[PDB]
């Protein structure tokens, strides 16, 4: 696409969440959700082949249906209270329908089946955008109404998302699905702590973003979609194995990496509220994430899979990637646990 | 007013049922997404008129503005789905299971 | 908001038509402007949790003006009790309720 | 007394519609160096009634492949909307006084495109489907400019009420401050009413008869009555908007007589145009409207937004 | 009420002419009369098959421009505001981006029909 | 400065619709800036009295608020009669 | 005339029931026109005018395009109608039975709260400035040019971006 | 919870100004400049009090002055006034601009006579 | 010749004047010899309703002037 289209489309993608985040009125929050939905569509389907077209279609009908449900909440609330914002007096069922619709937009299970497939049909950089920047708008709405959310709905969604994300990711050889199920599981953690401490949902989002960004950038370095494709990194970009491994352990919540901090503080704050049972199952199923992250580490940095003859040409050539952002996000996403007290508050 | 919102709200539910219960054509599911926009627009219009809130009457227009864009973007996608398989049947959009 | 930019810059992109009692074109009050203006002034500065209990009087009145549940109930009871009397034959409406008043002015 | 007032609207219009078919055939005649009808009655005056009677004794068609519900609905809708476009017209006092009459005319006119679409689709024939998909193309062509042209003219008028155009044009036709929009408005009305050189939905040359190829008898008669009623109305509307007839509150008979003379004259120019030009290609109709009229109409919309502002000539709300 | 009366009267006339057209003529139905028309030969295929739309991009661009009419139609009321500078500036920009959007599509061969 | 005239003459010959469209578009943005009447558009709209002019209680420190409407004080529409 | 609004909302409901059963998009586009028209009449009954005619205008142009797309992309040999299939015909009939039941039931257990059949018409217009002048919905919608100019920026940008969005989506 | 206090039907009795709108509109400009002080106090009462029950005295002085104003025209300028509003009544919007000739005669009666 | 078009053009002319003339007169015949009152805004509708109430015959067009006070 020509530079005018990129400027218009990339500005609109950026504009959406900023409108949702800066808006007092609910209809303007909805408007920002529409900008993101509309402008991402051309980006997703740019390569125009049978798979990205299905991906851009499944995404549209999912996110448009969820939009209509959110709008119904915004309108039933204006009927009940004559105002364009949710109040303590807003009907209970109005809030729950907003929650289910937004979770449908985030990809939280059981409204999750679309996310792994859409992430699979699109290029890596748009998976990065979809799994990161596109989550801030629905989440910023939820953080604005956390005093009102029914915790029983939120915890069932979070428990479901942590389980389904673990089980789903355990069966995947496609990296883009492993990233989608990774996302689903982490959204479970952000959502579980939402009605209690919304600040910890922002900590878990930010740490997830700076872990998920370099991971995509790492796969975008050689355009590697499979476990066998990523297994050739020792013979292609061996300098990358040291930080891919840590980021994967960091995404797994293993100490003493930055990714342990979000799970650990969420568990700590959940049990300040006596949320013992939910917290225990959440931490016990987060163990399953580490297993299929460990399996990836086995295939890439801790063993050498067979390589092919044509990869010798690849070595004669010179790469201009990755950029200075990959190194900055790799270190901060793994070696920042000793700064934990400065991140929570 | 009480009886009207109940009928309008049930109208929105029927279209949400229509959207969530696919048949063959993707175009038919697009028309249900317009049944929902029409129900929401009529509710907002009646709410604003009944309460005499003139400052809220811009809002029903924006719903139509941001509903057309979806209808346009939805129809644009339906062209790409037809250019691939020659129909708009949803059962064809299933490559991504693997 | 989540990024109080409008408040920081001191502008108002959408803050000025949030509720019924907001400014209307040609100074046309909205229905229940009096009640809402009371409720928003009651619950101002004390926070949402205090306001849910300490401005329950203002809110339940605004809620009644807006939705009129009790008003329709009450007028349903008067009309239904009159229906019962008239079937028995113990009440005939006045001339001014049966379409024969001396109109004012 | 209101029912009698419907009679003195729907009957004179229907009689005037029929004779438009006779005037069309004789003006086209003399323009082609012949005489047109002149045997069926004195100078053919009975020819319209013969054609009507013959069409309603002709066997009606129920094709085996046809979708009957829409097949029948479509001609019924066509003639209903043609007659309904008339009830708001102020001449100089309208039968039904609407605040947003102009929108009622825009909205009713658009809905009548569905009689072409549904009939063509319901015929389940290839030539009738070609005709329907030209109705879609023709509407996409003229709709955008036609609404904006009205917006430009109504910013000198102050409202969407048709009866307020009488008062706007008390001292001058809107044709003078607005002749560029009248020129573009006039061509739109030829496209709105499927009139040559824009008879693309019918287009006997390319499509045998277009959307109504499978229609015979009385159902086909209703389509024509609708087509010719619209011609009078669109030219009657153009007479009110742009050629404001003389209005004296003491002589309402003057306004009607002057209104009629200009409406007849504009209706003739439709017949004059049909005899003079070849038919557009329906792809070229879109290019005419989107690449010529639309750029000019947007500029005139911006001209007429600013024009009342920098002359302090804002029309009154009432 | 008048506007409801006049339109039922219009509908009843259209209905009444429809009934007379079907029950007055003498009808003789047989299969070869009621087949579809196609210039004297049998159709080679049903008329319900897909019919490619060579102007589809203009069709959906009509929708976007159709809603931009819905934003300009309040102008007759809007020129009654005290904030004339604002009303005018918003109006000029709105029409100008519709024009800028139209120019982009025109130069991208978007108004051209697909061959 | 020399080639433009050649272009403009060229466009004016073969594309007057666009040359007319740009001129009218650009002429509509200049005319409000330079007209000596653009200021009255707001004033006339402000001088049209839809709502009732609710009177104010005369405390006693109102020396420039008329008592009776036919007083020599208050906003006047002479500029509009003689406009 | 006391049942007037109730009937319009009942017709609106069916139009969306027929729409939800999803026959051929030729008929689904017919239900949206009749629901669009019915819904237009509701906004008129409640005192609207500009909002009534606009939603009718906008949905008239949307179904024109949708018709063009149906004949090109969403058409099969034997288009389905509401009577075409016995199972759909069952749920259209049954769907109407349910509303006659839900309205009658819910009217029995509250009598006023939701459906107040006893008092249809009594509660349509609540207040109205009887000596007003400036009250048309057009004046409220026109506030986008002065007071809620932000509404128009996002609306204009939405449409402006959409042209760029669709040209890229449909590009070859 | 409280009992709304309503005035009794004999608290609401006044002498009515039973003239058609054209009659009021024809006399509207002079009446605004003659019954102004009485009129201007009722409106102040109404916006200050926000209650119709609290101004049922100022509002009966509105009817007091409106009737006096018409009695002064029914005793000095009855026929110039009757030609004017009878001509203002004809128009369907009761527009002043169709009666500038009768209007002048009625003005040149109140001015000289009153 | 060409003037043989006139017999039909004249019929069409008479037909197109009956609507305007008949409606104007019918309005006067059903509104006491006055133009049918137009009500664009609520204020004008209020005046008609008040005129209907003070007429004494429940018709808004039966005006009462100074005779009545
Ligand atoms: C105007 C037309 C109305 C009168 C003709 C109605 C035709 C009709 O229904 O005949 C009665 C019907 C017969 O309908 P039909 O099939 O004979 O209608 C044909 C009309 N003619 C005879 C002129 C060709 O009687 C019945 O048997 C059922 C009643
Ligand atoms: C909150 C932000 C969430 C992250 C959203 C991702 C935004 C970046 C979108 C993208 O396309 O990422 C890929 C980007 C392209 O850059 P590159 O890989 O070097 O290739 C082309 C350059 N010639 O490569 C990048 O530079 C990605 C950098 C991501 C920055 C994350 C900051 C936190
Ligand atoms: C197909 C059937 C023909 C369809 C006709 C479609 C065109 C109708 C458009 C809607 C008419 C409209 O716009 O309503 C105007 C009018 C409101 O009046 P208003 O503009 O406010 O001015 C006077 C108020 N004092 O409205 C009114 O006065 C009251 C509402 C009248 C609504 C007319 C409905 C037409 C009849 C449809 C019957 C169903 C067809 C089957
Ligand atoms: C990426 C964000 C940063 C850039 C910010 C946005 C400003 C960009 C300025 C550079 C603009 C260049 O963008 C310019 O776009 C036009 C269309 O508009 C393209 O031009 C295109 O249309 C013209 C129309 O005559 C034809 O030649 C052809 O169809 C095609 O080339 C140019 O090839 C490109 O040079
Ligand atoms: C305030 C405005 C904010 C603007 C925000 C801008 C965010 C930055 C966007 C960066 C986009 C560039 O990122 C994207 O890079 C990838 C490579 O990874 C390119 O993507 C590429 O994928 C593969 C191989 O990589 C190629 O076969 C393909 O043809 C090409 O598209 C895209 O063409 C480019 O768009
Ligand atoms: C209960 C009365 C109240 C109204 C009920 C109707 C509400 C609206 C429902 C709209 C959805 C219809 O739900 C319908 O579900 C059926 C399965 O049953 C699915 O339909 C699918 O299976 C059925 C059954 O063989 C086939 O006839 C159909 O052609 C096929 O598409 C679709 O997903 C949806 O068309
Ligand atoms: C990105 C798209 C941008 C392209 C479109 C740009 C449009 C820009 C239009 C600028 C024109 C504004 O023009 C401006 O009009 C206003 C009011 O109308 C005038 O303002 C004047 O009149 C107003 C009332 O009308 C008075 O209250 C004010 O005190 C006085 O200054 C300005 O003197 C003139 O400069
Ligand atoms: C597309 C299909 C549309 C069909 C929709 C249905 C149309 C019929 C409307 C049914 C709604 C209720 O219709 C009618 O409402 C009135 C008041 O409004 C009810 O109530 C009426 O009778 C009751 C006693 O029973 C009395 O208080 C009084 O006379 C009146 O209120 C009636 O019992 C009911 O017959
Ligand atoms: C980077 C992406 C965003 C860039 C594009 C958007 C730029 C903003 C343009 C929209 C500007 C709206 O500008 C905003 O208008 C509103 C009303 O319209 C004004 O707000 C005003 O509203 C009403 C006016 O009756 C008053 O009651 C209120 O007190 C006053 O604040 C704001 O003071 C002004 O800031």
mmCIF file of N, CA, C and O in Angstrom, chain D residues 3 10 58-60 62-64 67 72 76 80 83-84 87 121 124-127 130 148 151 160 208 214 282 286-287 291 298 302 315 317, chain E residues 5-6 10 14 18 21-22 25 27-28 33-34 36-39 45-48 51 55 62 69 72-73 77 79-80 95 98-99 106 112-113:
data_model
loop_
_atom_site.group_PDB
_atom_site.id
_atom_site.type_symbol
_atom_site.label_atom_id
_atom_site.label_comp_id
_atom_site.label_asym_id
_atom_site.label_seq_id
_atom_site.Cartn_x
_atom_site.Cartn_y
_atom_site.Cartn_z
ATOM 1 N N UNK D 3 -62.126 13.303 1.836
ATOM 2 C CA UNK D 3 -62.200 12.274 0.812
ATOM 3 C C UNK D 3 -62.493 12.881 -0.548
ATOM 4 O O UNK D 3 -61.899 12.482 -1.552
ATOM 5 N N UNK D 10 -56.240 12.674 -6.967
ATOM 6 C CA UNK D 10 -55.836 11.436 -7.614
ATOM 7 C C UNK D 10 -56.486 11.245 -8.974
ATOM 8 O O UNK D 10 -55.954 10.487 -9.788
ATOM 9 N N UNK D 58 -56.352 -7.741 -21.641
ATOM 10 C CA UNK D 58 -55.313 -8.651 -22.072
ATOM 11 C C UNK D 58 -55.068 -9.683 -20.983
ATOM 12 O O UNK D 58 -55.120 -9.374 -19.791
ATOM 13 N N UNK D 59 -54.810 -10.910 -21.392
ATOM 14 C CA UNK D 59 -54.523 -11.961 -20.432
ATOM 15 C C UNK D 59 -53.294 -11.588 -19.613
ATOM 16 O O UNK D 59 -52.258 -11.244 -20.189
ATOM 17 N N UNK D 60 -53.354 -11.657 -18.287
ATOM 18 C CA UNK D 60 -52.154 -11.420 -17.488
ATOM 19 C C UNK D 60 -51.275 -12.656 -17.425
ATOM 20 O O UNK D 60 -51.740 -13.791 -17.548
ATOM 21 N N UNK D 62 -48.439 -15.211 -15.709
ATOM 22 C CA UNK D 62 -47.897 -15.792 -14.481
ATOM 23 C C UNK D 62 -46.818 -16.783 -14.885
ATOM 24 O O UNK D 62 -47.058 -17.995 -14.923
ATOM 25 N N UNK D 63 -45.623 -16.303 -15.206
ATOM 26 C CA UNK D 63 -44.575 -17.213 -15.675
ATOM 27 C C UNK D 63 -44.258 -18.280 -14.640
ATOM 28 O O UNK D 63 -44.347 -18.054 -13.434
ATOM 29 N N UNK D 64 -43.900 -19.464 -15.127
ATOM 30 C CA UNK D 64 -43.680 -20.590 -14.232
ATOM 31 C C UNK D 64 -42.468 -20.383 -13.341
ATOM 32 O O UNK D 64 -42.434 -20.905 -12.226
ATOM 33 N N UNK D 67 -41.390 -15.454 -9.108
ATOM 34 C CA UNK D 67 -41.699 -15.366 -7.680
ATOM 35 C C UNK D 67 -42.929 -14.484 -7.529
ATOM 36 O O UNK D 67 -42.844 -13.263 -7.602
ATOM 37 N N UNK D 72 -46.148 -9.599 -8.074
ATOM 38 C CA UNK D 72 -47.357 -8.790 -7.979
ATOM 39 C C UNK D 72 -47.110 -7.529 -7.167
ATOM 40 O O UNK D 72 -47.587 -6.450 -7.522
ATOM 41 N N UNK D 76 -47.710 -2.912 -7.879
ATOM 42 C CA UNK D 76 -48.589 -2.245 -6.923
ATOM 43 C C UNK D 76 -47.846 -1.165 -6.154
ATOM 44 O O UNK D 76 -48.373 -0.072 -5.939
ATOM 45 N N UNK D 80 -48.433 3.056 -6.263
ATOM 46 C CA UNK D 80 -48.759 3.685 -4.987
ATOM 47 C C UNK D 80 -47.826 4.850 -4.698
ATOM 48 O O UNK D 80 -48.271 5.942 -4.333
ATOM 49 N N UNK D 83 -48.445 8.000 -6.819
ATOM 50 C CA UNK D 83 -49.543 8.833 -6.354
ATOM 51 C C UNK D 83 -49.243 9.478 -5.010
ATOM 52 O O UNK D 83 -49.759 10.559 -4.720
ATOM 53 N N UNK D 84 -48.435 8.824 -4.178
ATOM 54 C CA UNK D 84 -48.149 9.348 -2.850
ATOM 55 C C UNK D 84 -47.175 10.510 -2.896
ATOM 56 O O UNK D 84 -47.169 11.343 -1.988
ATOM 57 N N UNK D 87 -49.193 14.123 -2.663
ATOM 58 C CA UNK D 87 -49.999 14.655 -1.572
ATOM 59 C C UNK D 87 -49.305 15.802 -0.843
ATOM 60 O O UNK D 87 -50.004 16.659 -0.294
ATOM 61 N N UNK D 121 -36.039 -8.901 -10.390
ATOM 62 C CA UNK D 121 -35.551 -10.110 -9.740
ATOM 63 C C UNK D 121 -36.629 -11.182 -9.692
ATOM 64 O O UNK D 121 -36.335 -12.368 -9.860
ATOM 65 N N UNK D 124 -37.322 -13.699 -12.738
ATOM 66 C CA UNK D 124 -36.470 -14.863 -12.912
ATOM 67 C C UNK D 124 -36.186 -15.099 -14.393
ATOM 68 O O UNK D 124 -36.288 -16.212 -14.912
ATOM 69 N N UNK D 125 -35.834 -14.021 -15.073
ATOM 70 C CA UNK D 125 -35.453 -14.053 -16.468
ATOM 71 C C UNK D 125 -34.178 -13.240 -16.613
ATOM 72 O O UNK D 125 -33.904 -12.347 -15.815
ATOM 73 N N UNK D 126 -33.384 -13.569 -17.623
ATOM 74 C CA UNK D 126 -32.091 -12.916 -17.750
ATOM 75 C C UNK D 126 -32.237 -11.448 -18.125
ATOM 76 O O UNK D 126 -31.523 -10.597 -17.590
ATOM 77 N N UNK D 127 -33.152 -11.122 -19.033
ATOM 78 C CA UNK D 127 -33.281 -9.733 -19.448
ATOM 79 C C UNK D 127 -33.881 -8.878 -18.351
ATOM 80 O O UNK D 127 -33.554 -7.695 -18.244
ATOM 81 N N UNK D 130 -30.996 -8.206 -15.944
ATOM 82 C CA UNK D 130 -30.151 -7.138 -16.462
ATOM 83 C C UNK D 130 -30.781 -5.786 -16.202
ATOM 84 O O UNK D 130 -30.088 -4.823 -15.867
ATOM 85 N N UNK D 148 -27.579 16.238 -2.443
ATOM 86 C CA UNK D 148 -26.732 17.384 -2.136
ATOM 87 C C UNK D 148 -27.212 18.618 -2.884
ATOM 88 O O UNK D 148 -27.145 19.733 -2.364
ATOM 89 N N UNK D 151 -29.888 20.041 -0.871
ATOM 90 C CA UNK D 151 -29.320 20.719 0.285
ATOM 91 C C UNK D 151 -28.841 22.113 -0.078
ATOM 92 O O UNK D 151 -29.066 23.067 0.670
ATOM 93 N N UNK D 160 -36.852 22.332 5.158
ATOM 94 C CA UNK D 160 -37.235 21.246 4.276
ATOM 95 C C UNK D 160 -38.711 21.274 3.930
ATOM 96 O O UNK D 160 -39.201 20.341 3.293
ATOM 97 N N UNK D 208 -34.541 -6.415 -24.213
ATOM 98 C CA UNK D 208 -35.770 -6.443 -25.002
ATOM 99 C C UNK D 208 -36.778 -5.466 -24.419
ATOM 100 O O UNK D 208 -37.370 -4.654 -25.132
ATOM 101 N N UNK D 214 -41.279 -9.495 -18.740
ATOM 102 C CA UNK D 214 -42.199 -10.589 -18.468
ATOM 103 C C UNK D 214 -43.569 -10.116 -18.028
ATOM 104 O O UNK D 214 -44.419 -10.945 -17.702
ATOM 105 N N UNK D 282 -24.865 2.805 -19.498
ATOM 106 C CA UNK D 282 -25.114 2.957 -18.072
ATOM 107 C C UNK D 282 -23.830 3.013 -17.261
ATOM 108 O O UNK D 282 -23.849 3.514 -16.135
ATOM 109 N N UNK D 286 -22.805 6.648 -14.722
ATOM 110 C CA UNK D 286 -22.077 6.798 -13.467
ATOM 111 C C UNK D 286 -20.958 7.814 -13.600
ATOM 112 O O UNK D 286 -20.777 8.667 -12.727
ATOM 113 N N UNK D 287 -20.192 7.736 -14.682
ATOM 114 C CA UNK D 287 -19.083 8.657 -14.866
ATOM 115 C C UNK D 287 -19.571 10.086 -15.031
ATOM 116 O O UNK D 287 -18.928 11.021 -14.551
ATOM 117 N N UNK D 291 -18.052 12.047 -11.888
ATOM 118 C CA UNK D 291 -16.851 12.752 -12.305
ATOM 119 C C UNK D 291 -17.123 14.144 -12.832
ATOM 120 O O UNK D 291 -16.174 14.863 -13.143
ATOM 121 N N UNK D 298 -20.398 19.362 -4.814
ATOM 122 C CA UNK D 298 -19.699 19.590 -3.556
ATOM 123 C C UNK D 298 -19.190 21.019 -3.465
ATOM 124 O O UNK D 298 -19.292 21.655 -2.412
ATOM 125 N N UNK D 302 -20.369 23.884 -0.781
ATOM 126 C CA UNK D 302 -19.491 24.745 -0.007
ATOM 127 C C UNK D 302 -19.669 26.204 -0.370
ATOM 128 O O UNK D 302 -19.458 27.077 0.475
ATOM 129 N N UNK D 315 -31.506 32.375 5.730
ATOM 130 C CA UNK D 315 -32.961 32.331 5.732
ATOM 131 C C UNK D 315 -33.496 32.161 7.138
ATOM 132 O O UNK D 315 -32.801 31.630 8.021
ATOM 133 N N UNK D 317 -35.669 30.504 10.185
ATOM 134 C CA UNK D 317 -36.092 29.147 10.502
ATOM 135 C C UNK D 317 -37.564 28.948 10.171
ATOM 136 O O UNK D 317 -37.934 27.984 9.492
ATOM 137 N N UNK E 5 -54.811 8.130 5.670
ATOM 138 C CA UNK E 5 -55.955 7.895 4.799
ATOM 139 C C UNK E 5 -55.551 7.948 3.337
ATOM 140 O O UNK E 5 -55.913 7.072 2.548
ATOM 141 N N UNK E 6 -54.803 8.981 2.954
ATOM 142 C CA UNK E 6 -54.519 9.185 1.543
ATOM 143 C C UNK E 6 -53.682 8.051 0.998
ATOM 144 O O UNK E 6 -53.746 7.749 -0.197
ATOM 145 N N UNK E 10 -54.490 5.262 -1.857
ATOM 146 C CA UNK E 10 -53.558 4.925 -2.927
ATOM 147 C C UNK E 10 -53.336 3.422 -3.017
ATOM 148 O O UNK E 10 -53.314 2.860 -4.113
ATOM 149 N N UNK E 14 -54.329 0.719 -6.153
ATOM 150 C CA UNK E 14 -53.351 -0.175 -6.758
ATOM 151 C C UNK E 14 -53.753 -1.630 -6.585
ATOM 152 O O UNK E 14 -53.531 -2.453 -7.480
ATOM 153 N N UNK E 18 -55.186 -4.245 -9.504
ATOM 154 C CA UNK E 18 -54.525 -5.538 -9.602
ATOM 155 C C UNK E 18 -55.548 -6.657 -9.673
ATOM 156 O O UNK E 18 -55.381 -7.616 -10.432
ATOM 157 N N UNK E 21 -57.283 -6.791 -13.090
ATOM 158 C CA UNK E 21 -56.425 -7.267 -14.162
ATOM 159 C C UNK E 21 -56.375 -8.784 -14.204
ATOM 160 O O UNK E 21 -56.222 -9.359 -15.284
ATOM 161 N N UNK E 22 -56.514 -9.449 -13.061
ATOM 162 C CA UNK E 22 -56.358 -10.894 -13.019
ATOM 163 C C UNK E 22 -57.668 -11.645 -13.168
ATOM 164 O O UNK E 22 -57.676 -12.742 -13.731
ATOM 165 N N UNK E 25 -59.784 -10.643 -17.383
ATOM 166 C CA UNK E 25 -59.425 -11.249 -18.666
ATOM 167 C C UNK E 25 -59.764 -12.727 -18.727
ATOM 168 O O UNK E 25 -59.947 -13.399 -17.713
ATOM 169 N N UNK E 27 -58.326 -16.201 -19.486
ATOM 170 C CA UNK E 27 -56.974 -16.723 -19.382
ATOM 171 C C UNK E 27 -56.911 -18.153 -19.890
ATOM 172 O O UNK E 27 -57.770 -18.975 -19.573
ATOM 173 N N UNK E 28 -55.880 -18.439 -20.677
ATOM 174 C CA UNK E 28 -55.643 -19.759 -21.250
ATOM 175 C C UNK E 28 -54.186 -20.112 -20.972
ATOM 176 O O UNK E 28 -53.287 -19.663 -21.687
ATOM 177 N N UNK E 33 -46.651 -21.200 -22.987
ATOM 178 C CA UNK E 33 -46.905 -19.773 -22.852
ATOM 179 C C UNK E 33 -46.196 -19.191 -21.641
ATOM 180 O O UNK E 33 -45.724 -18.053 -21.684
ATOM 181 N N UNK E 34 -46.122 -19.954 -20.554
ATOM 182 C CA UNK E 34 -45.642 -19.466 -19.273
ATOM 183 C C UNK E 34 -44.163 -19.736 -19.042
ATOM 184 O O UNK E 34 -43.670 -19.480 -17.944
ATOM 185 N N UNK E 36 -40.144 -18.839 -19.460
ATOM 186 C CA UNK E 36 -39.461 -17.544 -19.506
ATOM 187 C C UNK E 36 -39.125 -17.117 -20.924
ATOM 188 O O UNK E 36 -38.993 -17.934 -21.836
ATOM 189 N N UNK E 37 -38.979 -15.811 -21.097
ATOM 190 C CA UNK E 37 -38.653 -15.244 -22.393
ATOM 191 C C UNK E 37 -37.147 -15.135 -22.576
ATOM 192 O O UNK E 37 -36.428 -14.698 -21.679
ATOM 193 N N UNK E 38 -36.677 -15.527 -23.758
ATOM 194 C CA UNK E 38 -35.282 -15.320 -24.111
ATOM 195 C C UNK E 38 -35.105 -15.252 -25.621
ATOM 196 O O UNK E 38 -34.330 -16.014 -26.198
ATOM 197 N N UNK E 39 -35.826 -14.338 -26.262
ATOM 198 C CA UNK E 39 -35.666 -14.005 -27.671
ATOM 199 C C UNK E 39 -36.025 -15.151 -28.605
ATOM 200 O O UNK E 39 -35.591 -15.165 -29.749
ATOM 201 N N UNK E 45 -29.800 -21.704 -19.016
ATOM 202 C CA UNK E 45 -29.530 -21.843 -17.594
ATOM 203 C C UNK E 45 -30.449 -20.897 -16.841
ATOM 204 O O UNK E 45 -30.894 -19.882 -17.378
ATOM 205 N N UNK E 46 -30.721 -21.242 -15.590
ATOM 206 C CA UNK E 46 -31.572 -20.413 -14.759
ATOM 207 C C UNK E 46 -30.994 -19.010 -14.635
ATOM 208 O O UNK E 46 -29.799 -18.781 -14.812
ATOM 209 N N UNK E 47 -31.873 -18.063 -14.340
ATOM 210 C CA UNK E 47 -31.491 -16.674 -14.175
ATOM 211 C C UNK E 47 -31.071 -16.354 -12.756
ATOM 212 O O UNK E 47 -30.850 -15.186 -12.439
ATOM 213 N N UNK E 48 -30.982 -17.356 -11.890
ATOM 214 C CA UNK E 48 -30.610 -17.160 -10.503
ATOM 215 C C UNK E 48 -29.128 -17.384 -10.263
ATOM 216 O O UNK E 48 -28.683 -17.337 -9.116
ATOM 217 N N UNK E 51 -24.286 -13.069 -10.944
ATOM 218 C CA UNK E 51 -24.179 -12.043 -11.975
ATOM 219 C C UNK E 51 -23.113 -11.050 -11.528
ATOM 220 O O UNK E 51 -23.380 -10.178 -10.701
ATOM 221 N N UNK E 55 -19.125 -2.886 -10.871
ATOM 222 C CA UNK E 55 -19.029 -1.602 -10.197
ATOM 223 C C UNK E 55 -19.151 -1.760 -8.688
ATOM 224 O O UNK E 55 -19.628 -0.855 -8.010
ATOM 225 N N UNK E 62 -20.739 4.244 -2.461
ATOM 226 C CA UNK E 62 -22.019 4.929 -2.332
ATOM 227 C C UNK E 62 -22.494 4.917 -0.887
ATOM 228 O O UNK E 62 -23.002 5.924 -0.392
ATOM 229 N N UNK E 69 -24.132 12.189 3.409
ATOM 230 C CA UNK E 69 -25.306 13.032 3.218
ATOM 231 C C UNK E 69 -26.032 13.213 4.539
ATOM 232 O O UNK E 69 -26.487 14.311 4.870
ATOM 233 N N UNK E 72 -24.724 16.160 6.377
ATOM 234 C CA UNK E 72 -24.924 17.488 5.815
ATOM 235 C C UNK E 72 -26.376 17.935 5.838
ATOM 236 O O UNK E 72 -26.641 19.117 5.625
ATOM 237 N N UNK E 73 -27.315 17.035 6.090
ATOM 238 C CA UNK E 73 -28.728 17.374 6.027
ATOM 239 C C UNK E 73 -29.184 18.194 7.226
ATOM 240 O O UNK E 73 -30.202 18.882 7.132
ATOM 241 N N UNK E 77 -30.707 23.674 9.804
ATOM 242 C CA UNK E 77 -30.871 24.069 11.195
ATOM 243 C C UNK E 77 -29.589 24.633 11.777
ATOM 244 O O UNK E 77 -29.641 25.464 12.684
ATOM 245 N N UNK E 79 -27.270 26.585 10.454
ATOM 246 C CA UNK E 79 -26.935 27.965 10.120
ATOM 247 C C UNK E 79 -27.757 28.927 10.964
ATOM 248 O O UNK E 79 -27.787 30.128 10.694
ATOM 249 N N UNK E 80 -28.444 28.409 11.974
ATOM 250 C CA UNK E 80 -29.199 29.229 12.905
ATOM 251 C C UNK E 80 -28.473 29.405 14.224
ATOM 252 O O UNK E 80 -29.036 29.976 15.160
ATOM 253 N N UNK E 95 -17.071 18.717 3.974
ATOM 254 C CA UNK E 95 -17.186 18.618 2.523
ATOM 255 C C UNK E 95 -15.820 18.441 1.882
ATOM 256 O O UNK E 95 -15.703 17.839 0.812
ATOM 257 N N UNK E 98 -14.726 14.756 2.218
ATOM 258 C CA UNK E 98 -15.486 13.985 1.246
ATOM 259 C C UNK E 98 -14.887 14.160 -0.140
ATOM 260 O O UNK E 98 -14.751 13.193 -0.895
ATOM 261 N N UNK E 99 -14.500 15.387 -0.478
ATOM 262 C CA UNK E 99 -13.853 15.643 -1.756
ATOM 263 C C UNK E 99 -12.471 15.007 -1.827
ATOM 264 O O UNK E 99 -12.094 14.459 -2.866
ATOM 265 N N UNK E 106 -10.773 8.365 -7.175
ATOM 266 C CA UNK E 106 -10.737 8.654 -8.601
ATOM 267 C C UNK E 106 -9.356 8.385 -9.178
ATOM 268 O O UNK E 106 -9.227 7.764 -10.236
ATOM 269 N N UNK E 112 -13.337 3.385 -11.882
ATOM 270 C CA UNK E 112 -13.380 2.545 -13.064
ATOM 271 C C UNK E 112 -13.979 1.187 -12.733
ATOM 272 O O UNK E 112 -13.714 0.613 -11.676
ATOM 273 N N UNK E 113 -14.808 0.681 -13.638
ATOM 274 C CA UNK E 113 -15.397 -0.638 -13.467
ATOM 275 C C UNK E 113 -14.358 -1.713 -13.739
ATOM 276 O O UNK E 113 -13.542 -1.589 -14.651
#
